[PDB]
Amino acid sequence: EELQDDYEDMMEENLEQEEYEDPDIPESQMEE
Amino acid sequence: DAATSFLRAARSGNLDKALDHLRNGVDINTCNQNGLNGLHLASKEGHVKMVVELLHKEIILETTTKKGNTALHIAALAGQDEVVRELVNYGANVNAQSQKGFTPLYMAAQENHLEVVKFLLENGANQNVATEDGFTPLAVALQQGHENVVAHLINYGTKGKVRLPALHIAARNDDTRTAAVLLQNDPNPDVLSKTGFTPLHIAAHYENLNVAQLLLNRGASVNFTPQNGITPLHIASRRGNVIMVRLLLDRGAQIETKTKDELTPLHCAARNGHVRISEILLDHGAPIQAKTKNGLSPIHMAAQGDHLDCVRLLLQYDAEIDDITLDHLTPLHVAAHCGHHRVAKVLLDKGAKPNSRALNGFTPLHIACKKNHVRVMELLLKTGASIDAVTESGLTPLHVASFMGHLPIVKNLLQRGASPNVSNVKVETPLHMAARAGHTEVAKYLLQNKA
């Protein structure tokens, strides 16, 4: 506690690289 | 007499007396007969405040004693965990070798200082650097019987530096003093983390304006582009850091830079509903029609996030209301898919076409009926959405609702005069769709109608 942000993995999670990506345009085709 | 008194104050932790001596004019780099300067003496005794103050006063961090020991060597041998942490934060070389080849990790391991060994390993201490005799930290730990130290050394192995670089840590804390010392030692403000981000990226994420100004004044690249393409401006716009965005724009940040998925900073601002940042970027020339890899413009992202005011601002700046993604989804399609009826109301009041067709012929009404978004459905039907529009497969909104089993949608559609006897490309009615999915209530309402 109070020092987890000093580590690379925690910083990676904090910066959230996924939030700068286009996730997807879901369609969910009604048929199958 | 003055230098001797200063060194005695450093050993005893008398920070006031040492500071008064330094104010008088005593050389801060003065050392005793053994080559121990004030930093060495303070590090031996664990005087953390004295160490910090002397570092702020520009003591040479890697000065060695007559045996080749730096301050980090002495802190590790003395087992001063706080001092070791502080020295490493200010740029101490964790792999420094004394005259006889001892490293700080070796000194910590021989003395059974588990916390120091762990911290040094996490900071990239190399446990394979041997002494002149050929002994490693593991070898001395085994000889002295320090079982915990041996176990930690074996387990860590070569996991490497898992802490951030010191300048990244300073940037995270907005620590201008530590950053100034680090940059005095290492003039590279663009030091890289394992993930590829510079300290300016960290400063922009946390809106640490002071350290960001220091980094930019020391040659940091305002436009640094990692592999993923996330510049500091992208981070500032995504986080809603208005003041950081203004600072970065003033120092030459590019407005039109694209990430790996082709998101501009305006895309990041709109996606999180940051109205002021979106306005600033637009006023600085950000292209309002920029498209991601999937063909999403900022209005699409604003609609996707239910960011009503961001949608309003983008429309006020001449955003194309009927812009289409690669799937031919308009912002109205996105709003119907996510159930955001407020965004849909704003879009339709501004002239969005209520009968736009997606790639499979789905209209916004079709999507709203699929997802059971009744409020979007009522708005669309009240603003001229066709209730009998068919997709390519011949599906009406009633077909979709009956298949999904959304009873309120089916009820409302039938009450507004939707024929239940329409047919698909296969001659299949809403009743067929209800039967196929076993939605007994929807089938019962359909049959109580003229199905």
XYZ file of C-alpha atoms in Angstrom:
483
model
C 0.000 0.000 0.000
C 1.094 3.556 -0.917
C 3.902 2.137 -3.112
C 2.187 -0.252 -5.549
C 2.183 2.476 -8.217
C 6.003 2.402 -8.163
C 5.946 -0.945 -10.016
C 5.709 -1.557 -13.743
C 2.693 -3.889 -13.775
C 0.594 -1.626 -11.559
C 1.528 1.394 -13.675
C 0.561 -0.500 -16.831
C -2.829 -1.255 -15.303
C -3.240 2.352 -14.141
C -2.488 3.832 -17.573
C -5.092 1.543 -19.205
C -3.683 0.993 -22.683
C -6.996 -0.667 -23.597
C -8.859 2.659 -23.273
C -6.924 4.030 -26.282
C -7.996 1.155 -28.566
C -11.093 0.715 -30.706
C -12.556 -2.370 -28.946
C -15.132 -3.514 -31.493
C -18.379 -2.683 -33.279
C -20.620 -5.527 -32.048
C -23.477 -6.692 -34.258
C -24.850 -9.823 -32.542
C -26.355 -11.390 -35.658
C -29.929 -12.336 -34.813
C -29.810 -15.506 -36.914
C -27.387 -18.378 -36.331
C 37.062 22.815 12.272
C 34.027 23.719 10.179
C 34.296 20.634 7.954
C 34.898 18.362 10.947
C 31.872 19.829 12.723
C 29.776 19.402 9.572
C 30.755 15.739 9.293
C 30.026 15.190 12.991
C 26.590 16.748 12.482
C 26.031 14.468 9.488
C 26.947 11.399 11.546
C 24.756 12.460 14.476
C 21.822 13.507 12.288
C 21.966 17.130 13.488
C 20.372 18.504 10.344
C 20.064 22.048 11.713
C 23.756 22.286 12.591
C 24.793 20.738 9.266
C 22.529 23.124 7.343
C 23.960 26.092 9.247
C 27.480 24.896 8.413
C 26.585 24.554 4.727
C 25.068 28.046 4.780
C 28.340 29.336 6.238
C 30.283 27.926 3.280
C 31.588 24.479 4.210
C 32.236 22.315 1.163
C 29.390 19.808 0.961
C 31.684 17.249 -0.711
C 34.176 17.336 2.184
C 35.062 13.904 3.586
C 36.915 12.509 6.591
C 40.252 10.674 6.600
C 38.485 7.486 5.464
C 36.839 9.198 2.491
C 33.368 9.276 4.044
C 31.532 12.461 3.103
C 28.375 13.724 4.783
C 26.140 11.539 2.624
C 28.104 8.412 3.585
C 27.933 9.199 7.305
C 24.221 9.986 7.142
C 23.577 6.776 5.191
C 25.391 4.657 7.781
C 23.199 5.904 10.629
C 19.889 5.873 8.756
C 19.368 9.653 8.883
C 16.849 9.822 6.054
C 16.115 13.549 6.292
C 19.834 14.352 6.308
C 20.354 12.190 3.215
C 17.480 13.895 1.396
C 18.703 17.381 2.315
C 22.274 16.645 1.254
C 21.042 15.266 -2.071
C 18.999 18.442 -2.559
C 22.179 20.437 -1.859
C 23.902 18.702 -4.813
C 26.206 16.246 -3.057
C 27.878 13.933 -5.563
C 25.739 10.806 -5.355
C 28.333 8.262 -6.553
C 31.291 9.530 -4.518
C 33.212 6.547 -3.150
C 35.162 6.058 0.060
C 38.773 4.874 0.163
C 37.445 1.300 -0.081
C 35.321 2.150 -3.130
C 31.998 2.191 -1.270
C 29.257 4.520 -2.435
C 26.509 5.722 -0.123
C 24.312 2.868 -1.376
C 27.013 0.340 -0.447
C 27.132 1.750 3.081
C 23.346 1.859 3.433
C 23.079 -1.762 2.283
C 25.839 -2.994 4.600
C 24.329 -1.060 7.518
C 20.869 -2.423 6.665
C 19.206 0.997 6.338
C 16.141 0.202 4.240
C 14.766 3.758 4.212
C 18.141 5.160 3.164
C 18.501 2.525 0.442
C 15.042 3.392 -0.879
C 15.781 7.124 -0.861
C 19.166 6.731 -2.555
C 17.669 4.496 -5.240
C 14.885 7.048 -5.764
C 17.513 9.737 -6.428
C 19.429 7.667 -8.982
C 21.916 5.591 -6.988
C 23.663 2.963 -9.112
C 22.403 -0.336 -7.698
C 25.137 -2.296 -9.531
C 28.090 -0.190 -8.356
C 31.173 -2.238 -7.460
C 33.555 -1.372 -4.636
C 37.325 -1.826 -4.863
C 37.093 -5.511 -3.895
C 34.174 -6.066 -6.286
C 31.363 -6.008 -3.720
C 27.976 -4.746 -4.902
C 25.208 -3.341 -2.688
C 23.292 -6.596 -3.156
C 26.294 -8.600 -1.940
C 26.603 -6.422 1.163
C 22.892 -6.737 1.928
C 22.955 -10.507 1.362
C 26.000 -11.162 3.551
C 24.444 -9.198 6.435
C 21.031 -10.916 6.154
C 19.123 -7.744 5.231
C 16.160 -9.366 3.509
C 14.244 -6.149 2.832
C 17.272 -4.490 1.244
C 17.958 -7.580 -0.878
C 14.349 -7.627 -2.079
C 14.308 -3.911 -2.884
C 17.641 -4.090 -4.716
C 16.480 -7.064 -6.790
C 13.256 -5.256 -7.698
C 15.423 -2.329 -8.859
C 17.502 -4.379 -11.284
C 20.332 -5.480 -9.013
C 22.354 -8.130 -10.842
C 22.879 -11.126 -8.558
C 25.507 -12.584 -10.922
C 28.127 -9.835 -10.520
C 30.904 -11.614 -8.624
C 33.658 -10.226 -6.429
C 37.372 -10.483 -7.174
C 37.355 -13.780 -5.263
C 34.552 -15.063 -7.507
C 31.771 -15.054 -4.895
C 28.187 -14.054 -5.649
C 25.459 -12.787 -3.309
C 23.986 -16.290 -3.390
C 27.350 -17.826 -2.489
C 27.937 -15.585 0.533
C 24.323 -15.959 1.656
C 24.757 -19.745 1.523
C 28.079 -19.585 3.374
C 26.633 -17.444 6.173
C 23.482 -19.570 6.420
C 21.018 -16.767 5.630
C 18.267 -19.123 4.521
C 15.652 -16.450 3.806
C 18.082 -14.393 1.712
C 19.161 -17.492 -0.228
C 15.546 -18.466 -0.882
C 14.626 -14.994 -2.106
C 17.711 -14.815 -4.339
C 16.929 -18.209 -5.885
C 13.246 -17.400 -6.373
C 13.821 -13.984 -7.949
C 16.466 -15.359 -10.307
C 16.597 -12.931 -13.234
C 13.156 -11.314 -13.122
C 14.963 -7.994 -13.587
C 13.928 -4.451 -12.723
C 10.215 -4.618 -11.862
C 10.109 -1.131 -10.337
C 9.552 1.897 -12.521
C 12.575 4.044 -13.392
C 13.204 6.624 -10.687
C 12.139 9.539 -12.893
C 8.792 7.864 -13.620
C 8.231 7.514 -9.870
C 9.130 11.172 -9.348
C 6.710 12.177 -12.109
C 3.921 10.130 -10.518
C 4.374 12.043 -7.240
C 4.858 15.468 -8.896
C 8.208 15.444 -7.075
C 10.155 18.312 -8.611
C 13.099 18.070 -6.191
C 13.799 14.387 -6.830
C 13.241 14.916 -10.555
C 15.661 17.849 -10.546
C 18.339 15.754 -8.837
C 17.733 12.844 -11.228
C 17.940 15.084 -14.299
C 21.078 16.740 -12.950
C 22.588 13.250 -12.803
C 20.977 11.748 -15.936
C 20.131 14.440 -18.548
C 17.673 12.162 -20.387
C 14.081 13.203 -19.544
C 12.757 10.630 -22.044
C 13.923 7.590 -20.059
C 11.766 4.621 -21.026
C 9.786 2.254 -18.851
C 9.506 -1.405 -19.824
C 6.032 -0.575 -21.151
C 7.524 2.179 -23.336
C 6.094 5.272 -21.616
C 8.209 8.308 -20.734
C 7.908 10.249 -17.462
C 5.955 12.893 -19.382
C 3.281 10.265 -20.071
C 3.007 9.584 -16.333
C 2.891 13.304 -15.548
C 0.122 13.774 -18.118
C -1.888 10.868 -16.707
C -1.883 12.392 -13.203
C -1.931 16.051 -14.345
C 1.271 16.726 -12.405
C 1.837 20.136 -13.943
C 5.019 21.075 -12.068
C 7.008 17.965 -12.966
C 5.635 18.124 -16.519
C 6.917 21.693 -16.850
C 10.297 20.630 -15.469
C 10.496 17.689 -17.883
C 9.552 19.803 -20.904
C 12.010 22.533 -19.893
C 14.723 19.835 -19.799
C 14.213 18.566 -23.353
C 11.386 16.046 -22.993
C 9.629 15.187 -26.252
C 6.100 16.589 -26.046
C 5.203 14.333 -28.997
C 6.882 11.111 -27.859
C 5.204 8.223 -29.665
C 5.555 4.700 -28.213
C 4.716 1.651 -30.323
C 1.033 1.866 -29.362
C 1.001 5.481 -30.571
C -0.235 6.932 -27.261
C 1.267 10.416 -26.973
C 1.085 12.548 -23.811
C -1.694 14.589 -25.437
C -3.724 11.401 -25.913
C -3.370 10.592 -22.214
C -4.238 14.125 -21.119
C -7.340 14.223 -23.334
C -8.475 10.760 -22.217
C -8.057 11.632 -18.534
C -9.855 14.971 -18.805
C -6.776 16.952 -17.727
C -7.734 20.324 -19.185
C -4.724 22.202 -17.816
C -2.338 19.466 -18.954
C -3.888 19.513 -22.433
C -3.416 23.282 -22.604
C 0.204 22.976 -21.459
C 1.016 20.244 -23.980
C -0.626 22.171 -26.821
C 1.362 25.279 -25.881
C 4.616 23.279 -26.023
C 3.978 21.890 -29.504
C 1.878 18.754 -29.095
C 0.471 17.488 -32.395
C -3.317 17.607 -32.604
C -3.780 15.009 -35.365
C -1.552 12.182 -34.105
C -3.100 8.719 -34.303
C -2.733 5.773 -31.943
C -2.364 2.199 -33.186
C -6.145 1.991 -33.710
C -6.134 5.465 -35.328
C -7.655 7.370 -32.410
C -6.887 11.083 -32.272
C -6.843 13.044 -29.006
C -10.321 14.302 -29.916
C -11.472 10.670 -30.048
C -10.180 10.135 -26.506
C -11.802 13.342 -25.246
C -15.167 12.563 -26.858
C -15.142 8.936 -25.715
C -14.977 10.062 -22.065
C -17.271 13.079 -22.484
C -14.690 15.800 -21.793
C -16.479 18.792 -23.291
C -13.923 21.496 -22.487
C -11.025 19.415 -23.816
C -12.978 18.633 -26.980
C -13.614 22.347 -27.477
C -9.938 23.196 -26.925
C -8.833 20.532 -29.405
C -11.378 21.677 -31.995
C -10.225 25.281 -31.559
C -6.653 24.072 -32.142
C -7.645 22.435 -35.443
C -8.435 18.870 -34.385
C -10.255 17.166 -37.303
C -13.842 16.539 -36.234
C -14.332 13.892 -38.960
C -11.269 11.768 -38.159
C -12.059 8.057 -38.259
C -10.693 5.092 -36.330
C -9.871 1.748 -37.948
C -13.540 0.749 -37.605
C -14.619 4.090 -39.091
C -15.757 5.683 -35.825
C -15.727 9.472 -35.643
C -15.710 11.404 -32.353
C -19.506 11.807 -32.468
C -19.799 8.007 -32.557
C -17.657 7.708 -29.421
C -19.579 10.469 -27.642
C -22.885 8.757 -28.451
C -21.465 5.408 -27.330
C -20.592 6.869 -23.922
C -23.951 8.619 -23.372
C -22.054 11.927 -23.341
C -24.944 14.198 -24.249
C -23.120 17.513 -23.901
C -20.144 16.242 -25.903
C -22.537 15.219 -28.687
C -24.110 18.681 -28.489
C -20.721 20.383 -28.766
C -19.595 18.182 -31.662
C -22.806 18.922 -33.557
C -22.331 22.635 -32.859
C -18.891 22.297 -34.494
C -20.404 20.918 -37.735
C -19.887 17.223 -37.038
C -21.648 15.073 -39.629
C -24.790 13.847 -37.884
C -25.228 10.911 -40.298
C -21.579 9.834 -40.450
C -21.303 6.064 -40.872
C -18.807 3.505 -39.608
C -17.562 0.568 -41.670
C -20.678 -1.306 -40.506
C -22.774 1.655 -41.769
C -23.725 2.561 -38.194
C -24.726 6.189 -37.675
C -24.582 7.904 -34.274
C -28.320 7.243 -34.033
C -27.627 3.536 -34.577
C -25.035 3.660 -31.783
C -27.438 5.455 -29.441
C -30.158 2.886 -30.159
C -27.718 0.015 -29.627
C -26.626 1.370 -26.245
C -30.112 2.504 -25.207
C -29.117 6.167 -24.822
C -32.426 7.888 -25.504
C -31.139 11.345 -24.523
C -28.417 11.187 -27.177
C -31.013 9.887 -29.635
C -33.314 12.806 -28.809
C -30.513 15.305 -29.402
C -29.561 13.598 -32.676
C -33.112 13.467 -34.024
C -33.867 17.050 -32.995
C -30.797 18.020 -35.051
C -32.016 16.209 -38.171
C -30.558 12.703 -37.930
C -32.338 10.452 -40.408
C -34.532 8.047 -38.378
C -34.549 5.365 -41.115
C -30.825 4.975 -41.813
C -29.881 1.458 -42.918
C -26.956 -0.499 -41.512
C -25.108 -3.131 -43.552
C -27.786 -5.769 -42.877
C -30.619 -3.275 -43.391
C -31.159 -2.707 -39.673
C -32.675 0.674 -38.862
C -32.270 2.359 -35.471
C -35.784 1.142 -34.632
C -34.720 -2.440 -35.391
C -31.739 -2.117 -33.046
C -33.839 -0.532 -30.295
C -36.400 -3.333 -30.541
C -33.630 -5.946 -30.453
C -32.122 -4.522 -27.250
C -35.432 -3.784 -25.467
C -34.762 -0.028 -25.420
C -38.364 1.121 -25.251
C -37.600 4.816 -24.677
C -35.427 4.976 -27.800
C -38.230 3.160 -29.623
C -40.878 5.698 -28.589
C -38.594 8.595 -29.516
C -37.866 7.090 -32.936
C -41.527 6.337 -33.636
C -42.567 9.823 -32.502
C -39.942 11.390 -34.800
C -40.918 9.642 -38.025
C -39.337 6.188 -37.740
C -41.031 3.691 -40.047
C -42.776 0.978 -38.025
C -42.892 -1.461 -40.972
C -39.323 -1.069 -42.250
C -37.740 -4.391 -43.195
C -34.122 -5.504 -43.130
C -32.506 -7.460 -45.961
C -33.917 -10.660 -44.428
C -37.395 -9.080 -44.403
C -37.426 -8.651 -40.621
C -39.668 -5.940 -39.199
C -39.204 -4.439 -35.729
C -42.020 -6.714 -34.567
C -40.107 -9.727 -35.906
C -37.011 -8.698 -33.954
C -38.919 -8.005 -30.738
C -40.868 -11.270 -30.939
C -37.678 -13.247 -31.511
C -35.943 -11.568 -28.565
C -39.020 -12.018 -26.372
C -39.217 -8.352 -25.343
C -42.842 -8.213 -24.241
C -43.108 -4.413 -23.724
C -41.705 -3.730 -27.196
C -44.142 -6.183 -28.792
C -47.069 -4.715 -26.859
C -46.199 -1.134 -27.793
C -45.565 -2.014 -31.446
C -48.907 -3.801 -31.740
C -50.734 -0.960 -29.970
C -49.292 1.588 -32.422
C -50.636 -0.494 -35.319
C -47.901 -2.919 -36.359
C -49.212 -5.753 -38.508
C -48.410 -9.154 -36.932
C -48.899 -11.002 -40.245
C -45.815 -9.708 -42.076
C -43.392 -12.363 -43.311
C -39.636 -12.816 -43.663
C -37.617 -13.906 -46.709
C -38.592 -17.296 -45.417
C -42.316 -16.934 -44.966
C -42.092 -16.619 -41.190
C -44.247 -14.294 -39.118
C -43.592 -12.822 -35.667
C -45.588 -15.739 -34.262
C -43.119 -18.149 -35.875
C -40.248 -16.262 -34.245
C -41.941 -16.322 -30.839
C -42.621 -20.055 -31.178
C -39.040 -20.795 -32.226
C -37.608 -19.034 -29.161
C -40.379 -20.316 -26.882
C -41.520 -16.871 -25.705
C -44.946 -17.928 -24.480
C -46.067 -14.479 -23.302
C -45.150 -12.789 -26.589
C -46.880 -15.554 -28.542
C -49.962 -15.166 -26.339
C -50.127 -11.424 -26.980
C -49.600 -12.031 -30.699
C -52.426 -14.593 -30.780
C -54.729 -12.351 -28.727
C -54.059 -9.905 -31.563
C -54.877 -10.915 -35.167
C -51.745 -13.057 -35.593
